[PDB]
Structures are given as structure tokens and as C-alpha cells.
Design a protein around this ligand. Sequence first.
Ligand SMILES: *C/C=C1/C(=C/c2[nH]c(/C=C3[NH+]=C(/C=C4\NC(=O)C(C=C)=C4C)C(C)=C\3CCC(=O)O)c(CCC(=O)O)c2C)NC(=O)[C@H]1C
Ligand SMILES: *C/C=C1/C(=C/c2[nH]c(/C=C3[NH+]=C(/C=C4\NC(=O)C(C=C)=C4C)C(C)=C\3CCC(=O)O)c(CCC(=O)O)c2C)NC(=O)[C@H]1C
Lengths: 313, 315
Amino acid sequence: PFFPPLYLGGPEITTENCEREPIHIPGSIQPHGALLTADGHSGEVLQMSLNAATFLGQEPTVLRGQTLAALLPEQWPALQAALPPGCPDALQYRATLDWPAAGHLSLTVHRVGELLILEFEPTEAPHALRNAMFALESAPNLRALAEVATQTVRELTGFDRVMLYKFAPDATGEVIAEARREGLHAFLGHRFPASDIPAQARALYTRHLLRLTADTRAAAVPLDPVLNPQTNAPTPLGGAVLRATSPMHMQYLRNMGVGSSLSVSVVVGGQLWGLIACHHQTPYVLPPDLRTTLEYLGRLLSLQVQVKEALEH
Amino acid sequence: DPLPFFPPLYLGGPEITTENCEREPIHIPGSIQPHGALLTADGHSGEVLQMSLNAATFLGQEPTVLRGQTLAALLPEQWPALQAALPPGCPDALQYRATLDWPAAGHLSLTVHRVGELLILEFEPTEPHALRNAMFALESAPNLRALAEVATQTVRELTGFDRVMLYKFAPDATGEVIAEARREGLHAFLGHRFPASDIPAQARALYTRHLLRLTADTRAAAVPLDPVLNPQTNAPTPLGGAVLRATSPMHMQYLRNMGVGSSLSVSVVVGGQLWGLIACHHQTPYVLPPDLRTTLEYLGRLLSLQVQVKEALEH
Ligand SMILES: *C/C=C1/C(=C/c2[nH]c(/C=C3[NH+]=C(/C=C4\NC(=O)C(C=C)=C4C)C(C)=C\3CCC(=O)O)c(CCC(=O)O)c2C)NC(=O)[C@H]1C
Ligand SMILES: *C/C=C1/C(=C/c2[nH]c(/C=C3[NH+]=C(/C=C4\NC(=O)C(C=C)=C4C)C(C)=C\3CCC(=O)O)c(CCC(=O)O)c2C)NC(=O)[C@H]1C
């Protein structure tokens, strides 16, 4: 099973109970964005991140009464149609708001049962993706495909280190390709224990295909209330990219000298084949539109891995 | 019966009938569609060899001036990028794309690929979260039918085409329309089946490697290359990989007779085989700009993946 989260007086996580930390329900988010939850029917704002006032420019109480209808007039009917009752928690809808306080915000919404989860992040506003797609497809074998993928991602993102991280049948990880800035340790060829990404983390990565710690030293921002009014239970935040990252993991990242981390899942035959794994030495918020490019690349790599593995077997 | 290609018309080959169909060399027509321009150049020196006859009007230069310069001089910023992206021996399927600001012609999209020692350069005029939203909707579709319907509707919304079908090949290469989105008033092709020779076997081979072809105007005359043969080889210039390639007069006749002014289709390739097509129709001529066509190319790949996934959920 899972332990209760901390804020419901559950045990603190150690190396004896990695497998049981409830990472989907931390009750908090990373501070480079803001999150609101809301009722599926009424559009009634039920929870907000204590930092919402910053991003939205709204007097705190104003929000926690109001309706999405009021708050987002153009958007609220689109949401209603895009995310019908009963849809999967994996389905997401995005829009760009030109919002008074903040030039442009990206809005990302998904639905978990009766709750809409809304994420707001700063945003903005060429051929590198098309060029990359053809490059991946003409790679002659899996090894070269891995090399092209890591190089392409590094060029698109500027990340200090991009790795392709392949799982063995027992969930032992091996770095099979790597693109990195001069003057970093090489992780190419190295193998790591399964428990570095515990089973409850791998399952969640099979369904929700991208996550990140924008700053390995930033404090999480609580949800208020912490419990969903609807259920008097924790809000599931696994489908939210803003979810506060595990302190266990952030301790690991910090011990490696990483300041910013991001990964993308490569899913083949319904199973987690590997990850595109990015490190930056310093804090780094990759903007939403560039993340989208990596999300596309994730799908394309999933296709090409199967194609390429089929021409060996 | 499968038989080798006839020589093209310009090398004294025969004209094509319902009989010899499968031997038309549709990859070497010696000509392009008039809404863009094409140059060929030597892959090592960058000497310009062939150009479409309309090139002066896209590129704003006399032929003899174009042909008298190397790509190093014509494309000083792109020439080194081309050479890195398209190394000798690379496959003909690999494409490099850039946007140019050309004085006389505005923003041009440049698409380049390499066939042996030849570079082929295509120039076309070029111009929010719809793709991301579509990607997730496709993935959440519960079964093959719902996927097919979401895919057709999405493509129609992105493009404005009068008719978008999902055509699926059977094992005998006979095809069948399994989903479609269509303009009000058009009659339904859903569930109809069509014989295998409607897409003869050489076209289906070409459609497995080069994943998007089109006919922007089913009545437009083709524009010859000049000279027609590659001076490197005194042989035909391979245009399979060029979207500007001229369509077979057989297929343009099959289209006009249906009332179609514009045709476009994207291959859906599963396990190395052509599974089916995203085929689109418009009643009037219609040019879809290169950046919009890129969205369809990306959807072609997504759909190939999702078709595998939906079919595996099915035994
Ligand atoms: C108690 C158990 C421990 C534990 C927990 C834990 N680990 C993750 C997530 C990740 N761990 C990763 C491991 C590596 N990244 C690398 O680059 C290398 C090698 C150089 C390794 C071994 C990765 C990639 C992830 C995914 C997240 C990311 O991309 O940064 C989680 C889940 C994190 C979250 O979703 O919040 C958890 C709970 N880690 C341990 O090391 C043990 C002691
Ligand atoms: C003697 C040869 C004939 C022939 C040849 C031919 N066909 C193509 C390409 C296509 N034919 C298609 C057929 C259909 N389109 C539809 O909308 C329907 C049903 C409603 C059918 C059956 C399609 C979709 C294509 C793909 C091209 C496109 O999408 O426009 C070629 C190749 C043309 C080229 O690539 O240059 C050729 C040579 N078709 C016949 O019917 C016979 C008479």
C-alpha cells in the first residue's frame, strides 16, 4: 500500500520505506507556478496554492469564492467540452491567457473525478522539431538513435546533461547515451539500483509522461486547504507537473550537484522502456512551449525505439 | 502481375493506360507543381545544375545568373547547415527545413534532401495549442473507431479541407474508408471499398518511405525541370522525396472526374507496412502552407503509434 502523507501524520520516509512514500499526494507544488482546484460542475474554486496572489494578482479571498465562469469567461466552456466527466486523468487541455497582471500565462487543466486541476505558469509569444523528427527516423540503429535523441534534446534545451536511461527487465537502470557540457562527470555506461526510482514512481511515470524539479533547493508551496473539501481527502496531483518533488529525490539531486532536473518517459508496449533524463547545474524553469516539444519527442522516440528494436529481433 | 517501370515519356516511354498502370515511373516525372520552385545542386561543390522553369519568378533572378553561382554564394547562411544536416551517404528520406527571408519573394520555406551526389532544394512561400490538445485526445480515445473519428475531425479542423477520410488497406491492398469528416452536403464514402489497383503497387511502395504527397490544383500544368536530365548522370532526376513532384496524369484524371480540386494524404505506417492513409479532398484548388503541413506530418507519426496501441488492445 502507501503510508499516509506527512501532513496527515504518516511516517517520514527513509531508505527502508522508499516504496511507500505517497508522492502523488504531497499537498504542495513548486513555486514557479500556481495551482487552483475547482468543482467540475459549478466551476467553484475549492483549493489554491498559497502563492496564487502573486501570479494571478488577486486579493486572496477573492479567488476562493469565485467561479471559473467568472474568473475565466472565454475558457470555461472549452474546459467543459475538452474534459468531459469520466475522462482519464491523463487527458490535458492547454491555453495561453493574456492576463492583466502577467503578460502571458500558460494554463493546463486536467480532471480527476469531480475536480478540475488548473496550473498556471508564465509563458511567451521553429524547424528544429521537424529536423529532429527526420533525424531520429533515419538513425540506422538503436545506438545511433539514442545518440541523436540526447544531442537533439540538449540542443533544444541547453540542459547541462541529457541522458537516455534504459530499464533492464528487473528495473535496473543503465545510461546508454549521453550528451553533456564539457567538464561534467560521464554517466555513460553506468548502472544504478532499481530502488533509485521506486516502484510507486515507475507506475506513475507510465501514465504521466513528464516531470521536473525546477530548483532542487526551493521550498514547496502548500495547497490551502490541504484536503479537498469535496472528499475531505488529499487532492491527487500526479498528473500535475507543478507537484512538489519528493524530498528524498531532491536530496539525491542535491548530493549529485544538480540544480534543475527534468525527465520524459519512453513507453513501449504499455511498459516503461526508459527515460530522457535532463540535468542542469543551476535552477532552470523550462517554459511550457519548449516542454511540449520534448513531450512530442517522447512519443516519436517511443515509436522509433519499437521500429529499431524490431530490426534487430 | 508486377513488372518493371517504363522509361518516362521524355525518354520515349509509352503513354499510360488502365493496362500498364503499375509500370508508370511516378518518381521521375521531370517536372513539378507550379506553386513552388525546385533547384538541384552538386552535393560536394554546390554547383546549381537543374531548375524548374518558373524558378526566376520565385527567386527573382535570371536562370543564367542562378546557374552561374554555387549554393555557397546563393545561401551563405544555410550552405554549412545543409552540409552538416545532410552528410554524404545519408538516406533520401532525411529532410532539412529552414525559413529564408528572400528580397523579392517574402518568407520562403526551404526543404532540402540528398539523393546520392545530388541536393534537391524546394522553395515555397510560407506564412495555438491545437496540436498538443489533439495529441492528448488521440491518446485518450477508447478504441480504434473513436481514434479514427477524432483523427479525421482534428485534421479537418486544422486544415479546413472539405473531406478528410481514414482509408485503411486490407491484406489484398484493397482499401476501405473507415472514418471521415466531411462538409455539409457531400455524400458519404464511409464503409465503401475500392479495388487495389486504385493505388498501384509502386505507389504504395513509394508511400511507405515518403509519407506525404499532394496535388494542390488538379488542373494545373506541371513545370519542367531545365534541363530535364541530371547533367551528372545524363539520367532522370529522382523526385520521389520532393513534395513539389508532379502527380501522375492517371491520378489527376481520377481526381478531376470526382470533382476534386485539391488532394493531400499522409501515410500511416505500422510495423514497416503501409497500414492506411489520412487522405484529404477539397473541391477547389487549395495550397496548404508548409508549416501547417508539418502539423499533419507530426499527426501521421502519432497516429502510427496509437494505431499500434489500439490494435494490441484487440486480439
Ligand atoms: C527512498 C528511495 C529513494 C529514492 C526515491 C525517489 N526517486 C525518485 C525519482 C528519480 N530518481 C532518478 C534517479 C536517477 N537520476 C539520474 O540522473 C541517475 C543517475 C545519474 C539516477 C539513479 C530519476 C531520473 C528520477 C525521476 C525524476 C527526475 O527526472 O528527476 C522519486 C520520485 C520523484 C518525484 O516524482 O517527485 C523518488 C520518491 N531515490 C533514491 O535515490 C532512494 C534512496
Ligand atoms: C491506371 C492507374 C490508376 C490509378 C493510379 C494511381 N493512383 C495514385 C494515388 C492514389 N489513388 C487514390 C485512390 C483513391 N482516392 C480516394 O479518395 C478514393 C476513394 C474515395 C480512392 C480509391 C489515392 C488516395 C491516392 C493517393 C494520392 C492522393 O491522396 O491524392 C497514383 C499515384 C499518384 C502520384 O503519387 O503521383 C497513381 C499512379 N488509380 C486508378 O484509379 C487507376 C485508374
